[PDB]
């Protein structure tokens, strides 16, 4: 209608971590626009592999959010191929299955 749609809605990343995801995208591009940086990282995910997430997790722990190593790594893996079907690939029934 007349509102901007947050691109991360299509991804995982609970809405309580949109600010963290935006900051991670802005820092990976090594900028000094949140949405533009997010849209660029979504298409150039190779730049997220060089970012240090352990330092960010330590920063979060020192700020007062508790342990977030796994949460941040999950957000990074999400930026890389938003919602990737974790289900096992299709396989043809083997001999015993067919029998």
């Amino acid at each position: 209608t007349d509102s901007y749609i947050e691109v991360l809605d299509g991804s995982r990343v609970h809405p309580e971590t949109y600010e963290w995801a935006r900051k991670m995208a802005v820092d990976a591009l090594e900028y000094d626009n949140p949405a533009g940086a997010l849209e660029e990282i979504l298409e150039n995910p190779e730049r997220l592999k060089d970012l240090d997430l352990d330092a960010f997790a330590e920063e979060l722990e020192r700020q007062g959010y508790g342990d977030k190593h796994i949460t941040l790594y999950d957000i990074r893996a999400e930026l890389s191929c938003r919602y990737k079907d974790l289900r096992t690939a299709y396989r043809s029934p083997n001999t015993e299955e067919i029998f």
């Binding site: 820092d27 990976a28 240090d52 330092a55 920063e59």
Partner: peptide, 23 residues
């Protein structure tokens, strides 16, 4: 000069060379 907010830094060369052997 000092109003710069925290910035998520990049990994060191040691980490970039070591962690690359894990997947």
């Amino acid at each position: 000069d000092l109003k710069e907010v925290y910035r998520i830094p990049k990994k060191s060369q040691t980490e970039k060379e070591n962690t690359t052997t894990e997947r």
